[PDB]
């Protein structure tokens, strides 16, 4: 079952930054190859970050974006 959980995805870190992109599609913490995207950001989101724990891993809320 898909679960809402306010804590960071394994292997990742969230930086609150104005420099971040705007809210967009909810992305999974791992790529299609299985590589962790280590550094994430958000503009005005509060920690701990919104995440979805799904059958294939950890997804981040719409506000949380990859850093580069």
């Amino acid at each position, epitope marked *: 079952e898909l679960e809402i959980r306010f804590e960071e995805c394994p292997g990742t870190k969230v930086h609150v930054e104005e420099t971040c992109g705007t809210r967009g599609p909810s992305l999974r913490s791992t790529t299609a*190859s*299985g*590589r962790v995207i*280590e550094e994430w950001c958000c503009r005005e989101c509060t920690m701990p970050p919104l995440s979805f724990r799904a059958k294939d*891993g950890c997804w981040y809320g719409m506000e949380i974006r990859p850093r580069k």
Partner: antibody
Amino acid sequence: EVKLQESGPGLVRPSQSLSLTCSVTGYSITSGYYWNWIRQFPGNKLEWMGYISYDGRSNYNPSLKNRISITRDTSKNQFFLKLNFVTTEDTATYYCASFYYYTSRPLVYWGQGTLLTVSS
Amino acid sequence: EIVLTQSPASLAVSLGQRATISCRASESVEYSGTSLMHWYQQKPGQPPKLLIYAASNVESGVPARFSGSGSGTDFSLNIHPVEEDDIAMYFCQQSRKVPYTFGGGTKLELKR
């Protein structure tokens, strides 16, 4: 940052026991990944030895399923290659590697490797 | 055990020219329409590095001059234009069935 690092004795006499450590950094070994051991003989042929899952389930290469164990230390965040006895034919460079479970299972992470010589 | 046969064992290619390595599997590597076949590049003194996964998907960070193709039991890695960095060993690897197996490797040498 996700890092895998091997460590071991380097030289082991024949018929003795072998244990190699792979320390994992920046990710808990109790999530997501299958943690593998691959060795590269002289001549560069690669042989997959086995893995242990994030659940603690193990699977072994049938070529080794009389002498091999792959254990883990969840508190230290390491997993190990345990070979009950070694021959001179086990001389190789030993790699630890991982693949994510919900993928086509490519080995996305590798350790730097550790050289193991087996000789009297 | 799924046997992977790579060809050629070695190959010399001059800069800018196309280099294509082939891998053939003893049985089909497809599963659910996905080719469980991956490509790696290994330099001397270094671990293998993932180049192509699922036989056609270029991993993040890998230059666009690499490409993969094939299905079933026949796959091919393509490098064009070959650059100086690209001198290395290249391995195919199937993850369709356990135990996982690799090709014998293909040594890429440069012409000068």
